[model samples]
Target: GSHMASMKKKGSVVIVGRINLSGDTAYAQQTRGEEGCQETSQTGRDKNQVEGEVQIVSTATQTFLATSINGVLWTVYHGAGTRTIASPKGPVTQMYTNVDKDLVGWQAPQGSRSLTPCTCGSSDLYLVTRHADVIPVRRRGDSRGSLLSPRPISYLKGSSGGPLLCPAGHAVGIFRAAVCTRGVAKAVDFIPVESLETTM
Candidate 1:
């Protein structure tokens, strides 16, 4: 098969703005259920803002997904605070730990355990960065767990939830739990788009 597609027309790309948690200690303590940071609303949240890259998964609704990041999980939008979003894309919205169906999912492919299915399909996967920069990625190895790509020359700074497009320019996976060494990406684990869930 041929892994080819136009290098331009990068869509389904969006920048995840700064995440602002509340300072309501009383409310948080009251509503802190089994879901710690995952609490949706009416609770205390982190003071820290988890900002990074994310793709829109739906245009019909203001929806997107990211790794189990604090912002994605803890954010409560009720027409209050600034939205943790900055749009600049086409029709398709992207999400991770969430998926854009044809089917629907990549949680970072965990380090594979014992030997398994023939994993790692060699091809040139592409990433549309926060700046809409189209970049190339090579499959160093993959397992039934996740697809692993060799570290690139530069860092994919704040690139969690960035889409990993297949040769057909279709998003086949996403990344978040990245592996780094010396502050640069050494091994990137991609969650294939089959194991997605709307929420935990």
Candidate 2:
């Protein structure tokens, strides 16, 4: 049989939950296997390891890039996909300005909206939390997927407030930074779940 500590560790890695806030009231609940945490690697020198894990949370029809907003004990999701699901149960403020202020690069145009960059020229890549890209309506060779494509993308302008969802639908972090050139976006940085844990 497996050791209890091993079981506990596995459980800790498997069992996941959510905290929902509406207006001033906040609630905690479990999501079971309805898409929990997703794993990925953190970019940059801060990351000692090659990869890390992130949690994904969804509401209504969209997903979010999430981390423990309150503490490592409390997980929170953020990003464009969260727009439609912002107030899943009802309209409420899920963001904690005070808490968000503690995150790195919370002042960029995208702010803490995405986990990576989305602009045409940039070298920093980190996940922030914000709304999804509102593609332009005009048609042009350069506007191929920017306007209507729903596929997950990371960029300087659009990465802000964007959630990185894993295969199971769990949120990892917001797309904060990326390298963009010739209409192509390449990731350079992302918000680490560890950062959320440290802040909280």
Candidate 3:
């Protein structure tokens, strides 16, 4: 029994449900997992099922980059080679979070309290009922992973491959795992959004 909440659900690390605008709706059960995301069903209903062009980023922790038709980019977790993702199931107005291109550079937000309360979430959703402190680290090469100090309370399995937003709503990193020392949690290691450039 570990503190980590993320798990393999519906063949992927997470499952995002979809929303319908004109009185139509489709849930996760009716969504389609992306290509190469083996273990899920084929195509799903188009209007609700969120399907985007997936770019694979084979990093220290596998990541999948997706582009919505509206030009929004997402860094999703590729659980066991998951390539595609289901759609959004919320109100059409707030289906996807609005993110800025302000990537966290290697110099800003230098350590504890430098940032203005960052937040994160996923389709399955976990942690961040409160919020976490985003600690920016300067790393060399591909061994780069951002840190979020003080792990969220009760992080669940479906939180993986979610977005870590900065104070200004910048999608800085992808939520990955908790850095636990002994039985207690310390920090969370996430895939920096900069790394997503490889697949772009």
Number of the predicted model whose TM-score against the real structure is largest: 3
lDDT of 2 by residue, 32-136 (tens): 333322221101011111111223333323343343322221233333211211111222222333235223211111111222212222222223233322222
Candidate 2 local distance difference test against the native: 0.29
Give the range of the ten consecutive residues with the poorest summed lDDT in model 3: 103-112
Candidate 1 contains a number of clashing pairs equal to 12
- Reference-based lDDT, residue 137, model 2: 17
What are the runs in model 3 whose C-alpha is more than 4 Å off? Answer: 1-15, 18-43, 49-82, 86-156
Q: Deviation in angstroms for 55 in model 2?
A: 17
Q: Higher lDDT: candidate 1 or 2?
A: 1
Give the winner by lDDT. Answer: 1
Per-candidate TM-score against the hidden true structure:
0.37, 0.28, 0.39
Each prediction's Cα lDDT score? 0.34, 0.29, 0.32
Candidate 3 global TM-score? 0.39
Listed per model in order, the count of residue pairs whose N, CA or C atoms clash below 3 Å is 12, 62, 12
Rank candidates, TM-score, best first.
3, 1, 2
Candidate 2: list runs displaced more than 4 Å. 1-156
